[PDB]
C-alpha cells in the first residue's frame, strides 16, 4: 500500500488504542488481538501477516533518518517490551537509519513513528 494510506491505517488503529498490538498486513492493515509482542520470528511463532506488517515498514523507511527524537521513541518500545527489534546505524547527530529487524514482528505505535519519519522526509 502506499506511504501514506499505510501511515493512515496504522495512525488509526494507533487512535483506537492498539498501539501496543502488533501489525497484520494482507491488505488492509489489522492489529494483532491474539497474541503479544515477544520477539518473535516466523520459527518461533510470529504469523505471516506479522512478518508482511514488519517488512513492509521496513521497506518504506529504506534510507530514511530518523532523528534521535524518533530513536528515543523506539528505546522506549526496547524498554517498555523488554526487547530490541531494531538494527539501527548511527548516522551522527544523534540520528539514525534502520537497516534490519530483529523480529519478524513489529507493534503498530512503533509502525507509525517510523512511517513519519518517512513522511516527513518526502516532506
Known amino acids: ?8 491505517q496504522v495512525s488509526r488503529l494507533v487512535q483506537q488504542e492498539s498501539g501496543d498490538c ?9 492489529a494483532n488481538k491474539e ?3 515477544q520477539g518473535l520470528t516466523i520459527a518461533s511463532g510470529a504469523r505471516e501477516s506479522e ?7 521496513l ?6 533518518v530518523l532523528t534521535q527524537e524518533d530513536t528515543a521513541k523506539l528505546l522506549q518500545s526496547t524498554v ?7 538494527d539501527l546505524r548511527s548516522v551522527g547527530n544523534g540520528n ?3 537497516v534490519s ?3 519478524d514482528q513489529m507493534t503498530l505505535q512503533d509502525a507509525k513513528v517510523l512511517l513519519e519519519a518517512a513522511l516527513r522526509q518526502e516532506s
Open 1 to 8: 500500500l502506499s506511504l501514506s494510506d499505510l501511515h493512515r
Open 22 to 30: 502488533t501489525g497484520k498486513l494482507r491488505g488492509n492493515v489489522a
Open 35 to 37: 497474541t503479544t509482542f
Open 51 to 57: 512478518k508482511v506488517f514488519a517488512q513492509t515498514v
Open 59 to 64: 521497506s518504506h523507511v529504506a534510507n530514511v
Open 80 to 86: 517498555k517490551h523488554n526487547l530490541n527489534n531494531y
Open 96 to 98: 539514525s537509519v534502520l
Open 101 to 103: 529487524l530483529r523480529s
